[PDB]
């Protein structure tokens, strides 16, 4: 039993179709399925299912030499034919992958032999290898498990090459994984992992206290943060808090009054004491964010000027813009029209609600009336996709997505970022520059383009950065130190070594 663990997740892991999205969970897809090349903490990739590769001078044709010793968990061989059929299955559903620019860049994939796989691109797409390293969609299920030679309409058994095999799933109850005893790589120390489905954060904390589970691993929403801090003092428990992995921010709608006004967005960015918000709502556990990406993010150390909390400046900006207070009202008006902004968030998420309430209070102190619109998850996602918001909570994606993939996606109209930016006079230039940066191999030009994109987004006050958040862990001491994965969305269960 010291090599079996029980943990929790807010939902089931899903069917583990490697090539689809929700309800599939990206950490579980990564437990079962593997990439050609593996992302590393330093930003590089290493050989994985591909032992080596070459590329043409024009950077458009890539030939991977694959391992010849890998089997799917069902004993069938992994080879270049299997890899090629996976790429075909993914790209047969190309439109669904529009958010990921590699899916638009791949022109052809063919197996040249059992060990040679050739991928041709439209352009010299620089993030090629890092996008092949992602949890999805470019990982490999045994082609025997395709349905009518596709995966977009479903799969049979979720058969990968990875260190874990799905043993069984029970909807709304649990998922159980076991170690792959015929894995090509290192044997995990842990033999079995049970995921209890526990959607509520308090209930997760109770499950840990009672001993029903052994491990909690997740972001700032993992469990109540006051409880987390108590646990970190409890000598019967082990806890961890990682260095930050991504940004939580508001997106402001540049295409909707009154956030269409630069002066309004600038004022909002001076109105929030972020340290106080963190100490009040997140129990002092997270770090203040002054920019869309932390200065530690690749290409993002740009000396952008923070808008430090300064309500006097926020009021001055609003006054100068014609938003003044009517006697004897606390909410500003500009031609009888009140400064009113709707903030939408997931209504059942206690932490989001508490942050929304702080933001509403702080803005009220500078004469802006923020209306809280708490709705179900699906309604909030619908608002993001169609721009039906004034301000909306948002977050970046962590390594290896930040910044290149997050920026790439700003071009997709059915995403919150495009919608928030839609009102900017320079939106077409930004989208043009995002396209250029991804295909640049002139490193000087690449840095220049990232600087221009990020500086415009900063100077135009498109976002209200709030915090750089961390991964957190609560565990039974016997499990030992719990590692973090290079990819923020992954959970490195095969590295746990009690
Ligand atoms: O899904 C992935 O593989 C990675 N996701 C790619 C884009 N999604 C595509 C999608 O989910 O359909 C749609 C989407 C848009 C805006 C915010 C989040 C978001 O998921 C991004 C993503 C990265 C890290 C963690 C969670 C994530 O959702
Ligand atoms: O995609 O979450
Ligand atoms: Fe996604």
Residue nearest to atom 16 of ligand 1 (CA): 415
Distance separating alpha carbons of residues 335 and 412, to the nearest angstrom: 35
Core vs surface per residue 71-107: b (16+ CB within 10 A) or e:
bbbeeeebbbebbbbbbbbbbebeeebeebbbbbbbe
Q: How many residues are there in the chain?
A: 498
Reference 208, options 235, 227, 189; nearest CA is 227
CATH code of the domain containing 425: 3.10.105.10
What six digits make up the tokens of 426?
């320079």
Distance separating alpha carbons of residues 84 and 81, to the nearest angstrom: 5
Expressed in angstroms and rounded, the spacing between residue 196 Cα and the centre of ligand 2 is 20
Can you tell me whether residue 215 is helix, strand or coil? Answer: strand
- Matching residue, tokens 């559903």: 93
Distance separating alpha carbons of residues 91 and 102, to the nearest angstrom: 10
Cα–Cα–Cα angle for 3, 12, 346, nearest 5°? 125
Reference 438, options 134, 123, 137; nearest CA is 123
Pick the ligand that lies closest to the CA of residue 29.
1
What six digits make up the tokens of 338?
């009140």
Distance separating alpha carbons of residues 299 and 405, to the nearest angstrom: 13
CB-ligand 1 contact for 99 (6 Å cutoff): yes
Are residues 255 and 217 located together in one domain of the fold?
no
Pocket test for ligand 1, best of 24, 26, 221 (most atoms within 8 A of CB): 26
Core vs surface per residue 185-212: b (16+ CB within 10 A) or e:
eeebebeebbbbbbeebeebbebbeeee
3-state secondary structure 185-199: CCCCCCCEEEEEECC
Bridge partner residues of 391 (DSSP): 252, 343
Q: Is 39 exposed, middle or buried (0-12, 13-18, 19+ CB in 10 A)?
A: buried
Sheet containing 106-111: give its strands across: 50-55, 61-66, 116-121, 106-111
Q: Which domain holds residue 255?
A: 243-470
CB-ligand 1 contact for 381 (6 Å cutoff): no
Pairing of strands 246-252, 391-395: antiparallel
Distance separating alpha carbons of residues 36 and 33, to the nearest angstrom: 10
DSSP readout, 318-358? HHHTT-BPPTT-SS-EETTEE-EEEEEEETT-HHHHHHHHH
Expressed in angstroms and rounded, the spacing between residue 26 Cα and the centre of ligand 1 is 9
User: What is the torsional sign of CA 25, 31, 37, 41?
Assistant: positive
CB-ligand 1 contact for 90 (6 Å cutoff): no
Whether the CB-CB separation of 397 and 431 falls below 8 Å is answered with no
Reference 19, options 85, 93, 101, 76; nearest CA is 93
Are residues 313 and 264 located together in one domain of the fold?
yes
DSSP readout, 261-288? SHHHHHHHHHH--HHHHHHHHSTT-SEE
CB-ligand 1 contact for 177 (6 Å cutoff): no
Are residues 263 and 370 located together in one domain of the fold?
yes
Residue nearest to atom 25 of ligand 1 (CA): 397
Distance separating alpha carbons of residues 72 and 145, to the nearest angstrom: 11
Whether the CB-CB separation of 247 and 253 falls below 8 Å is answered with no
Are residues 293 and 360 located together in one domain of the fold?
yes
**R_g of the chain, CA atoms, integer Å:** 24
Are residues 39 and 74 located together in one domain of the fold?
yes
Distance separating alpha carbons of residues 315 and 367, to the nearest angstrom: 8
Are residues 415 and 466 located together in one domain of the fold?
yes
Maximum Cα interatomic distance, the chain, rounded to a whole number of Å = 80
Per DSSP (E only), the strands in 403-485 are 463-469, 472-475
Expressed in angstroms and rounded, the spacing between residue 322 Cα and the centre of ligand 1 is 39
For residue 204, how far is the Cα from the chain centroid? 22
Distance separating alpha carbons of residues 265 and 254, to the nearest angstrom: 8
Distance separating alpha carbons of residues 408 and 418, to the nearest angstrom: 10
Phi, psi of 406 (to 5 degrees): -60, -45
DSSP readout, 225-262? HHHHHHHHH-TTSEEEEPSP-EEEEEEE-TTSTTTTSH
Are residues 56 and 179 located together in one domain of the fold?
yes
Expressed in angstroms and rounded, the spacing between residue 317 Cα and the centre of ligand 3 is 36
CA distances for 359 relative to 315, 334, 432, angstroms: 16, 22, 34
Distance separating alpha carbons of residues 432 and 410, to the nearest angstrom: 11
- Which residues, including other chains, have CB under 8 Å from residue 135's CB and lie 6 or more apart? 26, 27, 29, 30, 33, 487, 489, 490
Can you tell me whether residue 93 is helix, strand or coil? Answer: coil
Distance separating alpha carbons of residues 383 and 390, to the nearest angstrom: 10
- Which residues, including other chains, have CB under 8 Å from residue 40's CB and lie 6 or more apart? 46, 486
Reference 17, options 171, 177, 152; nearest CA is 152
CB-ligand 1 contact for 21 (6 Å cutoff): yes
Are residues 180 and 304 located together in one domain of the fold?
no
Distance separating alpha carbons of residues 258 and 267, to the nearest angstrom: 12
State which approach was used to obtain the coordinates. Answer: X-ray
Are residues 190 and 296 located together in one domain of the fold?
no
Distance separating alpha carbons of residues 4 and 455, to the nearest angstrom: 49
Are residues 216 and 250 located together in one domain of the fold?
no
Distance separating alpha carbons of residues 132 and 126, to the nearest angstrom: 12
Report the number of distinct structural domains present in the chain. Answer: 2
Are residues 293 and 237 located together in one domain of the fold?
no
CATH code of the domain containing 492: 3.40.190.10
Q: Label residue 480 left, alpha or beta by phi (over 0 means left) and psi (-120 to 50 means alpha).
A: left
Are residues 35 and 144 located together in one domain of the fold?
yes
3-class SS shares of the chain: helix, strand, coil, % to 5: 30, 25, 45
- Which residues, including other chains, have CB under 8 Å from residue 376's CB and lie 6 or more apart? 346, 347, 348
CB-ligand 1 contact for 401 (6 Å cutoff): yes
């Amino acid at each position: 039993a010291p090599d079996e663990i029980t943990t929790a997740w807010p939902v089931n892991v899903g069917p583990l179709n490697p090539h689809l999205y929700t309800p599939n969970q990206m950490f579980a897809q990564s437990m079962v399925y593997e990439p050609l090349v593996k992302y590393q903490a330093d930003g590089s990739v290493i050989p994985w299912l591909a032992k080596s590769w070459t590329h043409s001078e024009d950077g458009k044709t890539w030939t991977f030499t694959l391992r010849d010793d890998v089997k799917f968990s069902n004993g069938e061989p992994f080879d270049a034919e299997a890899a090629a059929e996976n790429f075909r299955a993914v790209l047969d559903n190309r439109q669904r992958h529009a958010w990921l620019e590699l899916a638009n860049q791949i022109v052809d994939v063919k197996a040249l032999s059992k060990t040679e796989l050739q991928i041709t691109l439209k352009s010299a797409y620089y993030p090629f290898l890092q996008e092949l390293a992602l949890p999805r969609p470019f990982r490999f299920i045994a082609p025997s498990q395709f349905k009518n030679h596709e995966t977009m309409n479903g799969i049979k058994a979720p058969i990968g090459t990875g260190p874990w095999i799905l043993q069984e799933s029970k909807l709304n109850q649990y998922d159980v994984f076991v170690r792959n005893e015929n894995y090509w790589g290192e044997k995990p120390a842990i033999k079995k992992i049970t995921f209890n489905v526990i959607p509520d954060p308090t209930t997760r904390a109770v499950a840990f206290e009672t001993g029903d589970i052994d491990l909690l691993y997740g972001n700032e929403g993992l469990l109540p943060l006051d409880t987390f801090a108590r646990f970190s003092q409890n000598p019967a428990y082990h806890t961890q808090l990682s260095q930050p992995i991504e940004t939580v921010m508001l997106a402001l709608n540049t295409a909707k009054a009154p956030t269409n006004e630069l002066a309004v967005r600038e004022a909002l960015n001076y109105a929030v004491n972020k340290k106080s918000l963190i100490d009040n709502a997140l129990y002092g556990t997270q770090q203040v964010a002054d920019t869309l990406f932390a200065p530690s993010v690749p290409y993002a150390n740009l000396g952008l000027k923070p808008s430090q909390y300064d309500p006097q400046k926020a009021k001055a900006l609003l006054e100068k813009a014609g938003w003044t207070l009517p006697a004897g009202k606390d909410i500003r008006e500009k031609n009888g029209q009140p400064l009113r902004i709707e903030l939408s968030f997931i209504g059942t998420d206690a932490l989001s609600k508490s942050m929304a309430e702080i933001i509403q209070a702080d803005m009220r102190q500078i004469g802006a009336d923020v209306s809280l619109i708490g709705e179900e998850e699906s309604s909030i996602y619908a608002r993001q996709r169609d721009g039906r918001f004034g301000m909306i909570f948002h977050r970046t994606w962590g390594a290896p997505y930040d910044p290149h993939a997050f920026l790439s996606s700003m071009r997709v109209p059915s995403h919150a970022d495009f919608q928030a930016q839609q009102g900017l006079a320079d939106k077409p230039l930004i989208d043009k520059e995002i396209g250029e940066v991804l295909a640049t191999h002139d490193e000087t030009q690449r840095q220049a383009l990232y600087r221009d994109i990020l500086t415009r987004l900063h100077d135009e006050a498109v976002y209200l950065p709030i915090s750089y958040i961390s991964m957190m862990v609560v565990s039974k001491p016997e499990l030992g130190n719990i590692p973090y994965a290079p990819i923020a969305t992954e959970i490195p269960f095969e590295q746990i070594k009690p």
